[PDB]
């Protein structure tokens, strides 16, 4: 067996890491009307009703959750869809005008004092010659005084012009599946104790990921996926305090949010075939918006998180939780979108505790806004039309985003505070078990066969 | 019939098996290498074009080595012990294609070059022989 020769094999199972462009695939049920959705699943290919998955025995692979190129592509696609859904909508250039505002003091509690303003202004009409005098209600977070009934202006007038969101389109998230082209593949890690980095001893290959809902929020991961066995803590470098920590819950925690104001909508014609939806009067009483969580359920979940955090810091260290340090409203509060409106809740009653080495509810006051700056961009804003009637939504808390404070030496105390901001960490919490590889179906090996002349 | 009597078959299903056992399922991976103005306007077209180009590029190499239209093709180039001195038993019964690829990744281009010239010589000699008649 010394007269060995080269033999060529086509179609061998080997692969290499690669970066390519994936394409979406939405469910067929999404085609039943409901074309009014920001996530334009109209152009998404229908999914396979029966997905196929192959188990890869004896195969060990290396994953790096913090250098995944799938995350970068998802961010760009989400931003592009957001921008594209706003092109055929009204542009509110003429709304940049001096306003004459006064406080709304009519059946209000002591906490809603100075939060609503009643402004009136001149507006253009469908005819280019004449103008109209109108009025509307604005939140105190969208108006800035310029120098009784002092005169204000919209906060964005000196940076850009807002685009009104088309009232028919809906913001409800819809599951999306990412699929790879021919000649590529996606590997999935089935280990239940995977910590995001290192070798995964249980692997399998698929052609499309499971349905991922693009939910936007900060400080709290909503309507996500749950761990199978235990609370999972993941970080790029646990010993470095400049890196965020991701937490995945073992069980869900319910949160109830509502806006207890019966709002009214008005239509104002500002041009030929163009309308601006203002806020009329409020029918009834005026009260603050809030969110509810169960005190008992939250306490249990925090206890499990502490137990899994001591493994990286020792059994004889004090663990304490504190609220955010500072920054803009979008970073120091738990932001989210609940059926059209945009909330900014004060999560300072959640992170208030200290843990030693050894029925009721929590109410979080929230505010509301109408001028939205998404994706941390500058120069592009959006205007959210008012919603008529009362609002109520329910969802599950699935994880967290935390941050550690640099302490001198080992003071036996560690303090963690919530922190969000970058929206890539939201996608990273769902695509942590996937990677893209490239197939190489050509191999050469020695054998005893020889070509016949 | 019962074929080879396998527990199950699928794409890349034999990645963890010995090179001897994984050589009986080449068609499974071979048949899935071709198909198996909005945002998604070009993300669907460029991928298809790239897949076609890669497939054709792979096919051309087999074409110029004389192994067109085949899954297992024997050649006329002797194996050089410098590339690997391992036995024939510890290669086909104690290694997987993923491992084997790493070992001989350095010498791939040399073998690719040798095969081309072997085929060229074969073609020239065949033409001469036919011309003699």
């Amino acid at each position, epitope marked *: 067996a010394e007269n060995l020769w080269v033999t060529v094999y086509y179609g061998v199972p080997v692969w290499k890491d690669a970066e390519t462009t994936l394409f979406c695939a939405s469910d067929a049920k999404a085609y039943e009307t409901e074309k009014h959705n920001v996530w334009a699943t109209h152009a998404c290919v229908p999914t396979d009703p*029966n997905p196929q998955e*192959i188990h890869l025995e004896n195969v060990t692979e290396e994953f790096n959750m913090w250098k995944n190129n799938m995350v970068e592509q998802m961010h760009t696609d989400i931003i592009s869809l957001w921008d594209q859904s706003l092109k055929p909508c009204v542009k509110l250039t003429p709304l940049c005008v001096t306003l004459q505002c006064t406080n709304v003091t009519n059946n209000i509690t002591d906490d809603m004092r100075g939060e609503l303003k009643n402004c009136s202004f001149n507006m253009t009409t469908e005819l280019r010659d004449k103008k109209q005098k109108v009025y509307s209600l604005f939140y105190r977070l969208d108006v800035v005084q310029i120098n009784s009934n002092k005169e204000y202006r919209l906060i964005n007038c000196n940076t850009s012009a807002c685009t009104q969101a088309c009232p028919k389109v809906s913001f409800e998230p819809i599951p999306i599946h990412y699929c790879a082209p021919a000649g590529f593949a996606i590997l999935k890690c089935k280990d239940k104790k995977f910590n995001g980095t290192g070798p995964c001893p249980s692997v399998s290959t698929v052609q499309c990921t499971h349905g991922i809902k693009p939910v936007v929020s900060t400080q709290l991961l909503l309507n996500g996926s749950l761990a199978e066995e235990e609370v999972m803590i993941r970080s790029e470098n646990i010993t470095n305090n400049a890196k965020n920590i991701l937490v995945q819950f073992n069980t869900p925690v319910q949160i109830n949010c509502t806006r207890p104001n019966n709002n009214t909508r008005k239509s104002i014609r500002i041009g030929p075939g163009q309308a601006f939806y203002a806020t009329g009067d409020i029918i009834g009483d005026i009260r603050q918006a809030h969110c509810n969580v169960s005190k008992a359920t939250w306490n249990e979940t925090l206890g499990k998180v502490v137990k899994q955090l001591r493994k990286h810091f020792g059994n004889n260290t004090i663990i304490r939780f504190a609220n955010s340090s500072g920054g803009d409203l979008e970073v120091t509060t738990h932001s989210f979108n609940c059926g059209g409106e945009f909330f900014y809740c004060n999560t300072s009653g959640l992170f208030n505790s200290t843990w030693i080495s050894n029925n009721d509810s929590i109410t979080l006051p929230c505010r509301i806004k109408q001028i939205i700056n998404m994706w941390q961009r500058i120069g592009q804003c959006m205007y959210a039309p008012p919603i008529q009637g009362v609002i109520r939504c329910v969802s599950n808390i699935t994880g967290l985003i935390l941050t550690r404070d640099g302490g001198s030496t080992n003071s036996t105390t560690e303090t963690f505070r919530p922190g969000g901001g970058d929206m890539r960490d939201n996608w990273r919490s769902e695509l942590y078990k996937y990677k893209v590889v490239k197939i190489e179906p050509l191999g050469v090996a020695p054998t005893r066969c020889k070509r016949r002349v | 019939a019962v074929g*080879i*009597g*396998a527990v199950f078959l699928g794409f890349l299903g034999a990645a963890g098996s010995t090179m001897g056992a994984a050589s009986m399922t080449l068609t499974v991976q071979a048949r899935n290498l071709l198909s198996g103005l909005t945002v998604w306007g070009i993300k669907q077209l460029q991928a298809r074009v790239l897949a076609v180009e890669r497939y054709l590029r792979d096919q051309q190499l087999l074409g110029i080595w004389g192994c067109s239209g085949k899954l297992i093709c024997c050649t006329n180039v002797p194996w050089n012990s410098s590339w690997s001195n391992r036995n024939l038993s510890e290669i086909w019964d104690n290694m997987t294609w993923l491992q084997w690829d790493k070992e001989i990744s350095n010498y791939t281009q040399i073998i690719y070059g040798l095969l081309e010239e072997s085929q060229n010589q074969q073609e020239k000699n065949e033409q001469d022989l036919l011309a003699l008649d």
Partner: antibody
Amino acid sequence: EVQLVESGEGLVQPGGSLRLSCAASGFTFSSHAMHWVRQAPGKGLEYVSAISSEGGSTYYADSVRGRFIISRDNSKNTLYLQMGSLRAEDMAVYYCARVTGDYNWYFDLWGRGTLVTVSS
Amino acid sequence: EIVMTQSPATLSVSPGERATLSCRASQGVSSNLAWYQQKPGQAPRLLIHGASTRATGSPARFSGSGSGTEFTLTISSLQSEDFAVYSCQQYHNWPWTFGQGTKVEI
């Protein structure tokens, strides 16, 4: 008449070892793949391990990986299952099923079944 | 791991009339489904394979249908010998999985 019979039952201490055999007769044994399946008392059927026709490929379940070994002997038309480091949860009746065809993965002929018990 | 759910847990039907069983799949398994019957103390038997084809040698009264994630088994007539446990198995994604098993009582 095609049929499979299991043997080797007995009493085994926790952490012990036990070997089972599933003799076959009435068909070409070396042309079909085999499986091992167990049913715990009060639970459903769960897959344990499998082996290819020629005995060149073996598959294991996560709970048994590293403790169980499966082998076959085409000459004597026999199937073997070697158990090591037994535990309490390994309580069930074990059936040696058979696979039919190269694309019909469902079983077509089961076995009588044998009962294995662990106690101190 | 696709999870097979079989309902009702226990079914009591007198001889002669209809008897229906349900097997629900947490994920689309196409038509790769089979039904098995096991008498107490006997070797289980194959009844339906492919979710629509009757197993060779089984009585014709047995009949099942369904695709995707919903499947059903129906027997034209219940005989004295039909008392047994029935389970569904899917062979779409490895590993194969079984249902909990529905008990039929005369």
